[PDB]
Design a protein around this ligand. Structure first.
Ligand code: WYW
Ligand code: NA
Length: 118
């Protein structure tokens, strides 16, 4: 079993930056890949970024050049550095983790990101 706990969301102005964290607990040494997704109300989840144990990253077209996914194996934590946020980035962001030979998946509880000038 693998549990994921997210943090870092909140309010940010357009053009601002946030960093999200996804901390893994349990049998973290069997995690193969971890990814970031987001979901806005009434829409399917959108894939954002993926990273392997080796550090190979893959991004969706909508966040390339702005979002950076990284991982700290010692802390069992995957980060999503989000620069130059736009109102269209408002969503609940979820991290996932593939483990047990890429056969099992766990999801975080999600964290709300709202990009607004108020
Ligand atoms: C959500 C946290 O994800 P990460 S940093 O995994 C990113 C792919 O979890 C994690 N923790 C320890 N891991 C590990 C250690 C030794 C060998 C293989 C894996 N992997
Ligand atoms: Na953080």
């Amino acid at each position: 079993e693998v549990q994921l706990v997210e943090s870092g969301g909140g309010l940010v102005q357009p053009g601002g930056s946030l960093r999200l964290s996804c901390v893994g607990s349990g049998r973290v040494r069997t995690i193969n890949t971890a990814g970031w997704y987001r979901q806005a109300p009434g829409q399917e989840p959108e894939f954002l970024a993926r990273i392997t144990v080796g550090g190979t990253t893959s991004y969706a077209d909508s966040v390339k050049g702005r979002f950076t996914i990284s991982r700290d194996l010692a802390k069992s934590t995957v980060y999503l550095q989000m620069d130059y946020l736009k109102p269209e980035d408002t969503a609940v962001y979820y991290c996932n983790a593939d483990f047990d030979f890429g056969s099992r998946t766990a999801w975080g509880q999600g964290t709300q990101v709202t990009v607004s000038s108020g």
